[PDB]
From a paper:
Furthermore, a crystal of an inactive BIexoHep-[name]/[name] mutant with an unsaturated HP tetrasaccharide substrate was obtained, and the structure was solved at a resolution of 1.73 Å by molecular replacement with Phaser using the complex structure of BIexoHep with the product as a template. In the crystal structures, each asymmetric unit consists of one BIexoHep monomer, an unsaturated disaccharide (ΔUA2S1-4GlcNS6S) or tetrasaccharide (ΔUA1-4GlcNS6S1-4IdoA2S1-4GlcNS6S), and two Ca2+ ions that were confirmed by inductively coupled plasma-mass spectrometry (ICP-MS) analysis. Notably, the BIexoHep complex with the disaccharide product and the structure with the tetrasaccharide substrate do not show significant differences (the root-mean-square deviation (r.m.s.d.) between the two structures was 0.140 Å based on 786 atoms). According to the hydrogen-bonding networks, a series of residues, such as Asp70, Ser226, Arg230, Arg233, Arg332, Asn336, His337, Gln340, Tyr390, Ser554, His555, Arg579, Arg648, Lys755, and Arg757, participate in the binding of the disaccharide product (ΔUA2S1-4GlcNS6S) and the tetrasaccharide substrate (ΔUA1-4GlcNS6S1-4IdoA2S1-4GlcNS6S). The reducing end sugar rings of the tetrasaccharide substrate at the +1 and +2 subsites are tightly hugged by the side chains of the residues in the positively charged section of the L-shaped tunnel via a hydrogen bond network. In contrast, the nonreducing end sugar rings at subsites −1 and −2 have fewer direct interactions with the residue sidechains because the “+” subsites are deeply buried in the tunnel, while the “−” subsites are exposed to the environment. The residues His337, Tyr390 and His555 match well with three key residues His202, Tyr257 and His406 in the active center of Hepase II from P. heprinus DSM 2366, indicating that they may also play key roles in the catalytic mechanism of BIexoHep.
Herein, a type of exolytic heparinases (exoHepases) is identified from the genomes of different bacteria. These exoHepases share almost no homology with known Hepases and prefer to digest HP rather than HS chains by sequentially releasing unsaturated disaccharides from their reducing ends. The structure of BIexoHep consists of three domains: an N-terminal small β-sheet domain (Ala24–Asn150) composed of a large loop and a five-stranded β-sheet (β1–β5), a central (α/α)5 barrel domain (Pro151–Glu515) containing 20 α-helices (α1–α20) to form an (α/α)5 incomplete toroid structure, and a C-terminal β-sandwich domain (Leu516–Pro864) containing 23 β-strands and 5 short α-helices that fold into a three-layered β-sheet sandwich structure (α21–α25 and β6–β28). Further structural studies have shown that the active center of the exolytic Hepase is an L-shaped semiopen tunnel with a positively charged entrance and a negatively charged exit, which precisely controls the sequential cleavage of highly negatively charged HP.
Residue numbers in the entry: 24 to 864
Write the structure that this text describes.
């Protein structure tokens, strides 16, 4: 019942295998064919500093697909400049064969092995139309992207009485005759010039220049939309005036990073499509010159690269959408746009939206918000020009649950990904996204999230958030769809939700009444610690009433700086385990996974396995980033030869009590000192010996409490510190002044080859007193629960938890159960019994 994984990595930075996988049942009809490039290409390793990059040849691929193993009876064939193919027809049931070829410059075909896949009677069908169908009916008039000319007068009439629409005209009006200076006079480079490390210097320059470009983009976009809503040409004149100034910044030594360049493409698209029928010859040539120039640059970056990266953050967040809209703005007018529409349309269908198909966001809490406009505007646009519902992708209904569970109403986010610590309460962008899901998917949980939050805070959509990647005001001005009626309440959600492919879990005692909610979050993820994710496999965080207590420490000062690598991404910042003080590898190789779980009512359960996540850093991407950044992946900083053989963490939610039981199995290749970590981020912990173990009291500055009752199969010593491994220096000046210190508890065992830990965590606020832990009859009882477990380094692990009066039980053992976890639960008066075994993700 217990699976051992022996892969060096579960997910690849650069695609290494074909999809659909050999011998699999496909998840959708038609399958989405993808394969590794003939010349696999990592590409530039940072935004400001590319590092060592290889050639990226242009290539041609072919593909053949058939139920005839010898590829003569009824064969689907295609040729592409890129390693993905969409058949654009549902395939017949049965077994299928296929292969792909690389075609050399000389015309020779290099054919792959012949792969197999199967289609069932049950296989779901999601079959968007060919691009040829879409372009055939696509109108030649403008506007056609920001809105359609045939609907223009209707959109104007509808918004005459839309108070949200007034903001465009008010913001745009303040720009008129209010000149914009050149970039060198507007930018602040005073911090930039103090930085000697080139990764830091260029990253600071990107931030400082984006401040100005993003400010003025908001002005230009308001001018375009104000013109569209009023047809007052004063907005056209100032729109062209301002955009012309920004475009002249193009070749400035201060115009840094790819978002700034994509912003020029975006604004040129908006002005070209929206002002089209007013443009002078010179104005039209200016916009078209820059669409041609910058669209070609981005297409050339993407092709033979983007489609096979695990995920390419800036592209997924913003620049892909910007290329797509520039392409459809100009298709049939400039020849380059035919290739771009082909690429963008097929790449979206091939593998977007999202990476994890369970709906969770791979890069964590803050990164999700930078994707909001891409996740809605691209399928809204594709759907209206196609007549086909691109929101039928099941990812969206899945992601609706991620939106709610990862950050409940008025609550701190679950604590994953870069800048997690700043995500303190759902912002207007998140509510605007949930609103779009409610309308486009008729999703009642998304609708309940919007309505229950807007009842407490009716002005939430106008509160502060970064508007550039997330503001859906224009979607709300243009959609014909209404908010669905409030039906479901958030209180009708299951207490717990597990994202098996994302590798996360959220447990809640009262998700529908946030101020009373005791919450625990957990991560053990096949994505590992690359990109914006952290090295926090098998880490948990706790919350009460929407404010954290036990919580991942450190500050997001950058992407690769020493504080990030040693004290924020690093495993030592998290509520997990170190091995002789050493932590998890940085990259996809530092992966975890969730082998088994159970979402119930009187009891829920999740397990994380991080057995392979420790050791030396070997990721080529992160070794190159480290070389450029000054990182030392050495034992002194926390990475050494792997000693870890087995690390499973069992997390049991004890119904709605606010109690959680965390039980750890650990095995090493030799005797090692195990370090058990807890952190808080507002107040120090208070530690006393309690029976044969330790009591660790964490509290926040509000009502929140979390008490760890920690026991181990070996003797422990402990210490607490107020300082990070290395100072949280805000060299970028990207954070507020203060940057409080955090607090770090470490329990270290005597050296041993095996150890077990039991941690009973009591999470509450002013709703009740501390729970009393009774040590009786050689087990432990609290509030009617009875907890037995193995705390013998020489004996077999087991965990038995039962509440006889609630009718709940959990039994994990290697004897009766052969490694399985058996569950008994009560749901709607009915006895539920489950036997849980491992499954891969
Ligand atoms: O609290 C927040 O910080 C925050 C909350 C919001 O939800 C979110 O919208 C906002 O995102 C912005 C960041 O705050 C901002 N940080 S800043 O310091 O630059 O002002 C920035 O973050 C980007 C950056 O491009 C970069 O930031 S940082 O250097 O880590 O400080 C970094 O980008 C990586 C990138 O992820 C990598 N992609 S890859 O796929 O892994 O290869 C690759 O491109 O390298 C760069 C770093 O290169 S370099 O070192 O700079 O040369 O992280 C990005 C990010 O976190 O999104 O921009 C975001 C979004 O801008 S917004 O305001 O329009 O939303 O964050
Ligand atoms: Ca992202
Ligand atoms: Ca993370």
């Amino acid at each position: 019942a217990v699976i051992k994984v022996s892969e060096e990595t579960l997910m690849y930075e650069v695609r290494a295998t074909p999809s659909p996988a050999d011998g699999t049942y496909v998840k959708v009809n038609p399958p989405r064919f993808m394969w590794p490039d003939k010349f696999p290409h990592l590409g530039p390793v940072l935004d400001g500093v590319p590092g060592q990059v290889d050639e990226k040849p242009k290539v041609v691929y072919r593909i053949r697909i058939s139920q005839d193993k010898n590829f003569r009876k009824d064969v689907l064939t295609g040729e592409r400049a890129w390693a993905f193919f969409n058949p654009f027809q549902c395939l017949a049931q049965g077994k299928w064969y296929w292969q792909h070829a690389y075609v050399t410059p000389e015309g020779t075909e290099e054919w792959s092995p012949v792969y197999q896949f199967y289609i069932d009677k049950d296989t779901p069908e999601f079959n968007p139309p060919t691009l040829e169908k879409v372009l055939a009916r696509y109108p030649s008039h403008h506007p056609r992207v920001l809105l359609d000319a045939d609907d223009w007068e209707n959109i104007i009439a509808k918004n005459n009485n839309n108070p949200e629409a007034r903001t465009y005209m008010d913001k745009a009006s303040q720009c008129i005759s209010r000149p914009l200076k050149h970039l060198q006079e507007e930018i602040d480079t005073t911090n930039v010039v103090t930085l000697t490390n080139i990764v830091q210097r260029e990253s600071a320059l990107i931030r400082e220049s984006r401040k100005i470009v993003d400010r003025e983009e908001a002005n230009v976009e308001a001018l375009v939309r104000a013109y569209l809503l009023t047809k007052d040409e004063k907005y056209y004149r100032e729109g062209i005036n301002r955009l012309s100034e920004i475009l002249s910044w193009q070749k400035s030594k201060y115009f840094a990073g790819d978002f700034n360049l994509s912003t020029l493409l975006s604004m040129s698209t908006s002005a070209y499509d929206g002002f089209y029928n007013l443009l002078s010859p010179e104005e039209k040539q200016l916009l078209l010159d820059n669409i041609r120039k910058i669209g070609d640059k981005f297409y050339n970056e993407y092709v033979n690269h983007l489609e096979n990266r695990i995920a390419d953050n800036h592209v997924w967040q913003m620049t892909f959408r910007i290329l797509t809209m520039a392409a459809f703005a100009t298709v049939g007018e400039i020849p380059e746009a035919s290739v771009w529409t082909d690429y963008c349309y097929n790449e979206w269908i091939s593998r977007l939206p999202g990476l994890h198909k369970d709906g969770g966001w791979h890069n964590g809490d803050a990164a999700f918000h930078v994707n909001i406009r891409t996740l809605i505007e691209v399928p809204v646009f594709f759907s209206r020009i196609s007549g086909f519902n691109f929101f039928a992708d099941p990812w969206y209904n899945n992601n609706a649950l991620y939106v709610i569970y990862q950050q409940p109403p008025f609550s701190k986010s679950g604590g994953h990904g870069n800048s997690h610590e700043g995500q303190r309460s759902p912002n207007g962008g998140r509510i605007g996204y949930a609103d779009a899901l409610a309308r486009e998917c008729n999703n009642p949980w998304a609708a309940a999230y919007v309505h229950e939050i807007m009842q407490e805070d009716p002005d939430i959509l106008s509160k502060a958030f970064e508007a550039k990647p997330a503001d859906l005001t224009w979607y709300r001005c243009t959609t014909p769809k209404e908010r669905p009626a409030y039906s479901k309440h958030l209180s009708e959600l299951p207490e717990s939700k597990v994202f098996k492919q994302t590798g996360t879990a959220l447990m809640n005692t009262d998700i529908g009444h946030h101020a009373n909610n005791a919450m625990l979050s957990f991560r053990s993820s096949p994505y590992g610690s690359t990109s914006a994710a952290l090295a926090n496999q098998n880490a948990f965080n706790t919350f009460f009433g929407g404010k954290a207590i036990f919580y991942s420490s450190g500050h997001r000062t950058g992407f690769t700086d020493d504080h990030c690598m040693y004290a924020y991404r690093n495993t030592r910042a998290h509520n997990s385990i170190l091995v002789n003080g050493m932590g998890q590898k940085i990259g996809t190789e530092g992966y975890g996974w969730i082998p088994r779980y159970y979402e119930g009512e009187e009891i829920s359960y999740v397990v994380g396995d991080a057995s392979n996540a420790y050791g030396k850093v070997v990721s080529p991407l992160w070794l190159e980033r480290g070389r450029l950044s000054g990182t030392q992946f050495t034992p002194e900083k926390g990475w050494d030869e792997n000693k870890l053989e087995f690390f499973r963490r069992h997390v049991v939610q004890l119904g709605r009590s606010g109690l959680f039981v965390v039980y750890d199995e650990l095995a090493g290749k030799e005797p090692v000192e195990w370090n058990y970590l807890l952190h808080t981020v507002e107040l120090p912990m208070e530690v006393v010996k309690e029976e044969g173990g330790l009591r660790i009291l964490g509290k926040n500055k509000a009502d929140g409490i979390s008490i760890a009752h920690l026991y181990s199969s070996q003797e422990m010593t402990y210490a607490q510190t107020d300082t990070f491994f290395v100072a949280a220096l805000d060299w970028k000046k990207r954070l507020g002044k203060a940057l409080p210190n955090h607090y770090h508890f470490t329990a270290t065992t005597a050296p041993c080859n095996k150890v077990f830990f039991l941690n009973i965590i009591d999470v509450h606020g002013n709703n009740r007193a501390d729970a009393v832990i009774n040590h009786q009859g050689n087990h432990i009882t609290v509030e009617g629960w009875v907890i037995e477990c193995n705390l013998d380094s020489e004996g077999k692990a087991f965990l038995h938890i039962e509440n006889k009066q609630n009718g709940a039980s959990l039994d994990f053992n290697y004897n009766s159960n052969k490694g399985a976890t058996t569950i008994v639960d009560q749901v709607d008066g009915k006895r539920i019994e489950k036997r849980l075994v491992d499954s891969l993700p």
